[PDB]
Amino acid sequence: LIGKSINFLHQVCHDQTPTTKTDLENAFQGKIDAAYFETSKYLLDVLNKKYSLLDHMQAMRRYLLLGQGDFIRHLMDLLKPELVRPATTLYQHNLTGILETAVRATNAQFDSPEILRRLDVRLLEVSPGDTGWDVFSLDYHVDGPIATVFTRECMSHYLRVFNFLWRAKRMEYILTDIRKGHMCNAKLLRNMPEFSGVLHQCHILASEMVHFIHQMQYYITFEVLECSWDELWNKVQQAQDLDHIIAAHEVFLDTIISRCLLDSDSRALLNQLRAVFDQIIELQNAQDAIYRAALEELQRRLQFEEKKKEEENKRIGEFKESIPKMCSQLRILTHFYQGIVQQFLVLLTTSSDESLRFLSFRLDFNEHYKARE
Amino acid sequence: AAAAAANLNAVRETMDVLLEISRILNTGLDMETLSICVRLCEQGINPEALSSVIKELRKATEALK
Amino acid sequence: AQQERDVRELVRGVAGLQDEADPNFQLALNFAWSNFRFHRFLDVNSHKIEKTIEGIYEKFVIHSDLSKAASWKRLTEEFLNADAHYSILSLLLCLSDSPSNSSYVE
């Protein structure tokens, strides 16, 4: 181990200090452990300052694992029109400038420029999903000797967890578009107590989704990014070998793979989760299809008086055609949603005994289910 | 013969593995049209040609709409 | 000889024109053959096809679709053992490559 470490320290880093120092009546176990202590102390010193092992670790959680969040929200704001189109007409020179603009506008500007350079964009092959929104990634590139701890298999893990934490970080912002739409549109329907039934039923359906995507975004943080961070931070700050630092990092990332829904075994759970993301992007179109019929009538009704300074009778007739079909759509959408999330929650109890089960305990503290289950 | 039919069985195997590769990338081709496209590539012809042709002929049947 | 019958059957199958005495059949056929004879592409680069296959595998592993990644690797590794290979691959690739979040059923 010592002969290996002093050779890594030479052949890669090219940093050194001259002159390192029947049985042999215990001369092995004095010479070997003395030398081991000395070699490892200088090695860890220079790796954490000349190539900054710690800086890379700090920028692999803030950015890849989303432990920042100003940077990510400003990037998602500026990258929305880029993502909405299919990625065959998207090229990398359009990505890097938007990334740069975000970095200047958001909190990232105050950080060190080297790690910002080492974060850069990428593309996936042709257009994953054709919806446009699956096609993007951030990769943190490493080009120092510390590549040996950020091994080639663990970057793949980082990209998987980032992929899940990209889709959910979009869908949460889609549902707060639902809430933002309620808070503006319902103040025009303060003069029409005809839509109030379906408009209200929608308000309630929204809040039932809002909570569960606010339990995911907390269960990911205080157990998967705060036990795991403390665990890694201890297992680096104590450790007296690079070989221990590596084998702590590997398993810390593997544990994030298991607690997030990214196994091949949790595909059944992932299907239910994709089907509740389905309903979120569905609800947007269903929501706007109201206002593109309902709200449009009222402005025209005002313009009908503006011309006067039988047609509007047909619009009064149109109310009795619009409102029931809107309600009947919203009813089956609501009931289908409650059934599918309940079907998820019963399956959630056993795939793992404590961790995955805990979300189900956190989410209901009213026991709305078991009186609906 | 017998070994002269074993080769065509081993070609039938390759058509089945191509039948899986054709569906997992969600192409439009099925087994019967796929046999046509492999017999063309046996003679030697650009894939970049045949691909644009089937990309047109699939749109040339919703132009008799 | 068999090539001509194949191009006929390709028109019949893809374009949905099962009657050769339809003028639209002969027009689509003339189009197909004139497309084939208008040499305008570079020949297939086997190395670029290989790089595209491995990046598809990388995209499958990045999205934690392990069964699709393993099947993709197994099928492409099996098929690439006994030129025309890389042809049919690039063919299918340009053709749709509409593999979405699911599109699997492997």
| Token pair in block for residue C66 | 């392990």
Q: Rounded to a whole number, what is the distance in Å from the CA of C61 to chain A's nearest CA?
A: 7
CA dist., res. A249 & res. A237, Å (int)? 12
Residues of A in contact with C101 (CB under 8 A): 128-129, 134, 274
Q: Are A178 and A205 in contact (CB under 8 A)?
A: no
Interchain CB distance below 8 Å, B58 and C7: no
Residue A264 in contact with partner chain C when CB distance is under 8 A: yes
Give the residue on C whose Cα is nearest the Cα of B15. C79
Write the residues followed by a gap in chain A (C–N more than 2.5 A): 21, 309
Contact A134 C59 (CB under 8 A): no
Rounded to the nearest 5°, which phi and psi values hold at B59? -90, -10
How far is Cα A341 from Cα A213, in angstroms, rounded to an integer?
12
Which structure tokens are listed for A303? Answer: 């313009």
Which residues 6+ apart lie within 8 Å of A248 measured at CB?
A: A231, A232, A235, A236, A239
Q: How long is chain B? A: 65
A33: left (phi over 0), alpha (psi -120 to 50) or beta: alpha
Residue A306, sorted as left (phi over 0), alpha (psi -120 to 50) or beta, turns out to be: alpha
Q: Copy the structure tokens of residue A233.
A: 């931070």
Interchain pair B24, C17: CB under 8 A: no
Fill in the amino acid letter for A5.
S
Report the Cα C14 to chain-centroid distance in Å: 13
Shortest distance between the Cα of B63 and any Cα of chain C, in A, equals 10
- First vs last Cα of chain C: how many Å apart? 36
Fill in the DSSP letter of residue A290: H
- Give the SS3 label for residue A139: strand
A269 vs C: CB within 8 A:
no
Q: How far is CA A306 from CA A191, A295, A329, B61, C73, in A?
A: 18, 18, 35, 50, 69
Total Cβ atoms within 10 A of residue A160: 20
A288-292 long-range contacts (CB < 8 A, ≥24 apart) are: A288/A181, A290/A195, A290/A198, A290/A199, A290/A202, A290/A326, A291/A181, A291/A185
Cβ contact A138:A119 at 8 Å: yes
- Residue C94 dihedral angles phi and psi, to the nearest 5°: -60, -45
The subunits that touch chain A, with at least 3 C-beta pairs less than 8 Å apart, are C
- Which one of B17, B46, B61 makes the best mutation probe of the C interface by having the most chain C beta carbons within 10 Å? B46
Q: Which residues of chain C neighbour A156 with C-beta distances below 8 Å? A: 61-62
DSSP characters over A92-130: HHHHHHHHHHHHHHSGGGGS-HHHHHHEEEE--SS-TTS
* Chain B nearest C-alpha distance from C74 (Å): 10
Structural resolution in Å: 7.1
Residue type, B26: N
* Helix or strand (DSSP H, E) at A137: strand A137-140
d(CA A340, CA A265): 20
Please say whether the beta carbons of A83 and A94 come within 8 A.
no
Interface list for C 26-65 with A (CB within 8 A) = 52, 55-56, 59, 61-64
Comparing CA positions, the residue from A242, A221, A60 lying closest to residue A139 is A60
Sequence-distant (6+) residues with CB within 8 A of A46 are A9, A13, A15
Residues C67, C58: Cα–Cα separation, whole Å: 13
* CB atoms A137 and C98 under 8 Å: no
Q: Can you say whether the dihedral through the CA atoms of A59, A65, A69, A74 is positive or negative?
A: positive
Give B-chain residues touching C9 at CB under 8 angstroms. Answer: 32-33, 36
Distances (CA, A) of A221 to A218, A224, A358, C62: 5, 6, 14, 22
Q: Of the candidates A130, A262, A263, which has its C-beta nearest C98's C-beta? A: A130
